[PDB]
């Protein structure tokens, strides 16, 4: 019993989505990241071009939209897999290959593909935009390492730890750090790293992450964490999860409205990218198994302007004294 | 049987080191990082203020040299109690969770410690870094910090499996696990010189940072030689069937080659550098030298000897380490 999603945000998709999808399907087939035709079909069936065309709907350069979409395909293909000890090494190697073009594949299937993506990013993006994506990619790999860690030990994390980890393990950091690369609109340091923008970025990531949890009811996820800790039933957890998520999005809209008016063209595009991304991520979740009409919740299920109790690690999102920008 | 260190770089130490060491000893006592009197005295005996006062010897504000110095103390304590000998040293699953929690505590001032002694200490250091560094410098430190932790996770993974990495994985891993990224990312905070994104992130500058880090990491491995530990020596003894004495000569050759390429690239990049990049590059240089000099002095006033010449002066990439070959590629580092 799944309530409709609260997402009063702009929905749009690149007009050239289908041309990019074609080129991306080509690159998947040639990438070497897939053993069998059955594995390609699985990665092709993620419709990651359709996903990311919703994040950068007006990207001037079709090739930047392709490069950024390819990573999303790479991410789905990488996460369809490993013990923590081998993973920590593999995470280290893959991330080195992202940062070091002279790194060699050593027969690892994912490294050439990521290095082809990195080479496309280095031919378009500034060294600054590449370093942002690089750091986001390591943050994601740390999240995955954390989640594989918990599973191998049978640690079910409490809410604060789950939300912190899922911030990273969902792949939201690298996805949102590709907005600039797709658009070409370079956000200056003093704007991109304002705490206020950091909280907007994390809050957009968290809501996309909790919406991915919801699209997965069909084993570390907000529902398990709430059931295991708060002794809730599935329904009671579904209802509590929707309240957490809707409260976070409410904070996002509020902080966004405080921040958007003073913003430069580049930060402004980035912020419309967060919004497009949150909505795109929800809409892609509903439309992926395409053209049927979607139903959306008109109101938050919880309107509280105060921080989530039991999640101190995300409380600073609500602390305007800390975010004076 | 160890040859002297090739290190023809500026030795200098902050004229206020002794005052800063005093306030840092005070902070280590009320820090909470340390269970016993015995640990406190260990942390203190790292002389981390002397170490980092070599990295930023003209720091205008000793509060900034202090804050940065604190992380170096936190660093030794974190390695010694969580990474090298802690029940976590062979438990990557548990270490992966700790690294997530410690990193989150550094990015999120509202995070709670969950009874981990190292977190409130880190959060205090973070609060200082935020009080006078720009949010850009704080993020460069925070990113460098997760990089360091990823390296330790890789190291601890290898220890659990009894896996001795090869030269390529070892140099890539050690680039991170030896804590040089966050060490060097504190130069800006210590000095107040905000290096613009366009300059800091130039591949040439990134390569100098990595080479400054590799060299300091291999001087650390040299410092730790005075079988099963992952270091350049067991790496070479295992993968290339060498005696310890052959590994030692081999390690010295590779390290000196990297230092020469650092020196060559430094000389091509320094002339055009703006004032903030120039300060950062003097830091890399002061750091390399500071790391080695601190390592021969840490039990310290006696005359040291240095190698007048490198052990190998080949101007091309290390054999068997393609992950660093791009440091020699002047086209990619335009």
Numbering used by the authors:
A (entry chain B): 7 to 87, 96 to 232, 241 to 311, 324 to 359
B (entry chain A): 7 to 232, 239 to 311, 324 to 358
Give the authors' words:
To this aim, a small library of 24 variants of SvS-A2 was rationally designed, based on the SvS-A2 crystal structure targeting the active site as well as surrounding residues. The variants could be grouped into four categories based on their substrate preference in a Malachite Green assay: promiscuous (I), inactive (II), diterpene-specific (III), or sesquiterpene-specific (IV). A Trp156Tyr exchange (Group III) results in a highly active and diterpene specific SvS-A2 variant. The variant’s specificity for the formation of the diterpene spiroviolene over the formation of sesquiterpenes hedycaryol and farnesol can be expressed as the ratio of apparent second order rate constants and increases ca. 2.3-fold from 38.4 ± 13.7 in SvS-A2 to 88.1 ± 29.8 in the Trp156Tyr variant of SvS-A2. The exchanged position is located directly opposite of Trp79 and the introduction of Tyr may allow for additional cation-π interactions in 2, while yielding sufficient space to accommodate the bulky diterpene intermediate between Trp79 and Trp82. The Trp156Tyr exchange slightly reduces the melting temperature of SvS-A2 (from 71.3 ± 0.0 °C to 67.7 ± 0.1 °C) and more so of SvS-WT (from 58.2 ± 0.1 °C to 45.2 ± 0.3 °C).
Spiroviolene synthase (SvS) from Streptomyces violens was first described by Rabe et al. and represents a bacterial class I diterpene cyclase that we were not able to produce in sufficient quantities for crystallization due to protein instability. Terpene cyclases such as SvS form a variety of complex multicyclic compounds with potent biological activities via carbocationic, electrophilic cyclization cascades of relatively simple substrates, either by metal-ion assisted release of an allylic pyrophosphate (class I mechanism) or by protonation of an oxirane/ene-functionality (class II mechanism). We previously reported a hypothetical ancestor of SvS—SvS-A2 26—which shares 77% sequence identity with the extant enzyme.
